[PDB]
From a paper:
Mpro is a cysteine protease that cleaves at no less than 11 sites on the replicase polyproteins. Initially, Mpro releases itself from the polyproteins through autocleavage. Then the mature Mpro forms a functional homodimer and transcleaves pp1a and pp1ab.
Further, we solved the structures of SARS-CoV-2 Mpro mutant (H41A) in complex with six cleavage substrates from replicase polyproteins. Substrate selectivity is revealed using structures of the H41A mutant in complex with six individual native cleavage substrates. We demonstrate that the subpockets (S1, S1′, S2, and S4) which are endowed with an exceptional selectivity are important for selective and potent binding.
Residue numbers in the entry:
A (entry chain A), B (entry chain A): 1 to 300
C (entry chain C), D (entry chain C): 301 to 308
Write the structure that this text describes.
Amino acid sequence: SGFRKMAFPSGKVEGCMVQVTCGTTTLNGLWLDDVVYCPRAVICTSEDMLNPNYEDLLIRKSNHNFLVQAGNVQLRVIGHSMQNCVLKLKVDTANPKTPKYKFVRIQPGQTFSVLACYNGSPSGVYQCAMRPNFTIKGSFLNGSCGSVGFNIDYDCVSFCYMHHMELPTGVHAGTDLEGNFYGPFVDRQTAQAAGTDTTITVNVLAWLYAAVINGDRWFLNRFTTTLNDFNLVAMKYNYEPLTQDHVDILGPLSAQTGIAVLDMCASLKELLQNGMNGRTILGSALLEDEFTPFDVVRQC
Amino acid sequence: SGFRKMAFPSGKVEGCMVQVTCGTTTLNGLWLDDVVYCPRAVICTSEDMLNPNYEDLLIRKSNHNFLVQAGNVQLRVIGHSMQNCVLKLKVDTANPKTPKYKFVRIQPGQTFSVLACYNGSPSGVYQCAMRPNFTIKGSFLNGSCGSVGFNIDYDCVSFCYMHHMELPTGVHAGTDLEGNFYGPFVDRQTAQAAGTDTTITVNVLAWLYAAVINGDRWFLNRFTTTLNDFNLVAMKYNYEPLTQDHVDILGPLSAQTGIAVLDMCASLKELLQNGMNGRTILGSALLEDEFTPFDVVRQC
Amino acid sequence: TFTRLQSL
Amino acid sequence: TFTRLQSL
């Protein structure tokens, strides 16, 4: 029993984290087999960052301009190239700690674990969702560039995020591991802003099922609603529309609790219209939307 | 920027987790040097659990009754003994992954990271506080017995908790690593209940400072209060009294933000008396008390 | 309601 | 307000 914001164990990723220095700029890299992956922003300096031309900056570099440190050992760079917004530094030593892994891009509404790192050194682990507006509400300080986000599927680490930058609202933006940004953001220090966000409805429903599984039942009611009358209420409160795919996803959880999805939707509608009136659900006074149906099943 | 419930990276602890089986009972153990530590409840069976006499049960065991599995490899048990509520199984192989470590007992109000494990296999990591009533609000299923809680201080893992059981309210109880329970609980399946809990005041203040550091300022006011008029309000809302030690602990955070501790206490008093009225602090609609002053400084 | 020693 | 590439 109980329900926590739970991250994947980070050991497999900690053994891949290195430090990358070019000039006076340092950040984190990910060392898998004989390649080190890092944000291409490592090749910029203070003045370059407003309007850098990265192809120009990289042509002016050679292998010996990149200092890669794996704990104590310096790694010898024997090739370099750019793929979208990440650099690939080929090194002369395959990482003996390389796990089985994949590079996967995630969808808004999906969750992942973040291993925050500074100077190649893992500092903390936490769980994040990709927001509908392709930002994440992370916790990141200067030096965290190149920290990675991931899921573990059995023995296999699916890397899905590399951290690049902080937006003015204090939310965070980054790329997948082939260097393609999530959302309409670029790796230069300009006046970019996140678009308007929405609440991830299927996730809020999943969390309500977790609450019931854990004995929190006060928000339940006898009513049911139709998928369309619900979706009509969802729009007014800035919630995403619910699809039949989502109802299907929630199937196992509705089976385990005996509460039809449209039954739980009627509870969500009432919570949205009347609030909680001083009560809590799974320790929170807000409707929580950063747990997927998969997260709930795995933990419960 | 940003503020998350952040755990320590778990790699150093993952390399110590093993499976311990005795009879038809299986749980997790912690393998450090040539010793495996686990809950003594491993030597009980279904009927033994109501009123077990553990000294009796252990005298009836020999080394060959304990099956220890470290991943693929079975470890040979060459000695066994009981210390309070934990068993020490001496094995013929020192763990090559043993980190530098300490066994420390923590105080109510202090936080730690939990590595939830099943059949010796790490499943997830999350951050917990020890509640004033010596329970923790964990997330634990059958098979999680023997999972451990810890902090990392630089390269050194300070183990502080081993999980034993779930109380009827769904909160959790366990021991330090010398097998001494936190709180007035025993390792037998009887009708034990947690005492009444309180809110950890110094932690709520620390979190309010984190909020200000992150640009959340709406709850601030021009007022100040005295330590005693605050402590008078704290009692009515089931908050712990604030000590001058606590004011001292909060010193650095008040210096970084320029907000005197007693100034921030005046904001807490108003939040307690009027609520938040539809607003949030660092993403929460509740006053959060599971971050210590140290947690805030480290993350901010 | 009884306590649960969460072995397997 | 400008974006911050959080290198060191």
